[PDB]
């Protein structure tokens, strides 16, 4: 059967500077043990006696035996000088009760309660349970109480008294996943360039955990970190991968991953590493082109070029152009390797049919595509002449070849008001002779 103590009473009140005497009656007695706040004492004698109590002698005193059966006393050293013992580190986790460590030295007091700093009120929904032996306990600490500051308040002789400040820190409980973003959705690098992507993780706490993984590889990558606190419950981390010198087999998907007690987010970037640069060219129209006299035409290439192309030029019959061609990337997005080149030719003259070439270069490669352009023309009539034999001949010059009727490629037609008229798919032109006979 457990120990028994003299004084018997569960609660004892002693004046400051009074003597304290407790005796525990146990053939199996082992120790007195005394606790308040964090402080501990343990004493070997079956008597615990103290000649002059100080306020910090307030607390709980427990007698225990070789069975481990125990019996307890709590002692209040009433000292008018300070009513509270305080232990002032007041951390609390969100959604959890949180104790404010202001146990009393005199239990014979009224209205023991919790109250704000500088006469500011407490948040309206904050509620608490008081306890002289332990302190005053704040239920269900919310984020709105972060850095809330608090006094412990007690009414004595009809007059109200305050402890030293307490400032309530709040460890947030996670209620959403970390939020993750990456500087570039995908990369393309010439072999030997330096891959460097930077994740960004945002959460309420710096105990969010984040890593970079080469997909289908478990191994750890090297990385460098920077992080900031942007006010309360707002943390941001930036984690930067680098492959110091890209090799071809580094092509793959990297994943940036972030999890907290609530859940997980990942965000991924994909790297292509190309052993040497390239250009590929596609004409948006047949390379052979036909135009009529005075007609209008465009020449159009689309090409994919990495690295970004450095010289773009258009040449006609080995003589270069300017002021007639437009160059633009095909899409806006920052992953763009594809480009469009157009040349515009206006009301083309008959002589300007020929060959037109487009030349593009980057460091690695130089590539050409060539276009063949035929200016059709109305037949035009060169000679109408009557020869010594009495014959008369018409000549027409055209593309496509003229056909000749009587009423560039070059055609001549011969005969023994006459008219010569020369037609092809573009038009007609005609030349005149008039004859009288006697």
């Amino acid at each position: 059967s457990p120990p028994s103590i003299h004084p018997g009473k569960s609660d004892l009140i002693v004046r400051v500077g009074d003597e304290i005497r407790l005796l525990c009656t146990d053939p199996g007695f082992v120790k007195w043990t005394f606790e308040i706040l964090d402080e501990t004492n343990e004493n070997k004698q079956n008597e615990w006696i103290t000649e002059k109590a100080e306020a910090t002698n307030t607390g709980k005193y427990t007698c225990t035996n070789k069975h481990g059966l125990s019996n307890s006393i709590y002692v209040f050293v009433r000292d008018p000088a300070k009513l509270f013992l305080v232990d002032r580190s007041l951390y609390g986790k969100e959604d959890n009760d949180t104790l404010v460590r202001c146990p009393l030295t005199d239990p014979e007091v009224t209205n023991y309660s919790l109250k704000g700093c500088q006469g500011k009120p407490l948040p309206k929904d904050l509620r608490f349970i008081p306890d002289p032996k332990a302190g005053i306990m704040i239920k269900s600490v919310k984020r709105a109480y972060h850095r809330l500051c608090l006094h412990c308040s007690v009414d004595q002789e009809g007059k109200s008294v305050l402890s030293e400040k307490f400032i309530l820190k709040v460890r947030p409980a996670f209620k959403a996943v970390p939020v993750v973003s990456v500087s570039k959705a995908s990369y393309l690098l010439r072999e030997g360039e330096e891959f460097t992507v930077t994740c960004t993780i945002k959460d309420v706490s710096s105990s969010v955990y984040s890593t970079w993984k080469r997909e289908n590889s478990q191994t750890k990558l090297q990385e460098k970190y920077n992080s900031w606190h942007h006010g309360d419950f707002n943390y941001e981390r930036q984690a930067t991968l680098t492959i110091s010198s890209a090799r071809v087999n580094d092509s793959g998907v990297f994943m940036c991953y972030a999890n907290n007690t609530f859940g997980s987010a990942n965000v991924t970037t994909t790297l292509e590493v190309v052993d040497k640069g390239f250009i590929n060219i596609f004409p948006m129209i047949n390379t052979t082109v036909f135009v009529n006299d005075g007609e209008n035409v465009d020449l159009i290439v689309e090409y994919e070029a990495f690295p970004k192309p450095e010289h773009q030029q258009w040449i006609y019959m080995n003589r270069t152009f300017t002021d007639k061609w437009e160059d633009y990337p095909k899409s806006e997005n920052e992953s763009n390797i594809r480009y469009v080149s157009e040349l515009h030719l206006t009301r083309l003259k008959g002589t300007e049919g020929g060959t037109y070439t487009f030349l593009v270069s980057n460091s690695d490669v130089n590539a050409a595509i060539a276009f063949n352009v035929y200016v059709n023309t109305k037949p035009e009539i060169l000679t109408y002449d009557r020869l010594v034999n009495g014959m008369l001949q018409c000549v027409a010059a055209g593309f496509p070849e003229p056909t000749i009727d009587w009423y560039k490629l070059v055609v001549q037609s011969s005969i023994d008001t006459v008219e010569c008229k020369a037609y092809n798919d573009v038009g007609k032109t005609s030349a005149y002779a008039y004859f009288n006979f006697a």
Partner: protein, 121 residues
Amino acid sequence: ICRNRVTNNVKDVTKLVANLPKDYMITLKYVPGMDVLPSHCWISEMVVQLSDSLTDLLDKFSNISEGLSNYSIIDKLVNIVDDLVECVKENSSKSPEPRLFTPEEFFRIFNRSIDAFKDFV
């Protein structure tokens, strides 16, 4: 371990030390012999006492909107130390008498305490 919990708002400390008055005194329950001793025994107590001192020091300043301010810098340092306490109480997991320091000396002690978390147990 807990190297992640110390965000890099600490570089601001050199500016905070430059804006606090040279003759201003700041109060810390300094663990005696923190200088000579190994990291592990003093570091547990010191992050608690630094959290306390930095919070009191935080009360002393107003909060400017524009630019950096002592209240901003100290508030972010207080976030750090309140996380280092949260981890130390949770990974080791097994008072001194107040002394008065000029801001350069108090921040010397602070920067040494944070340099403790670059190889902790």
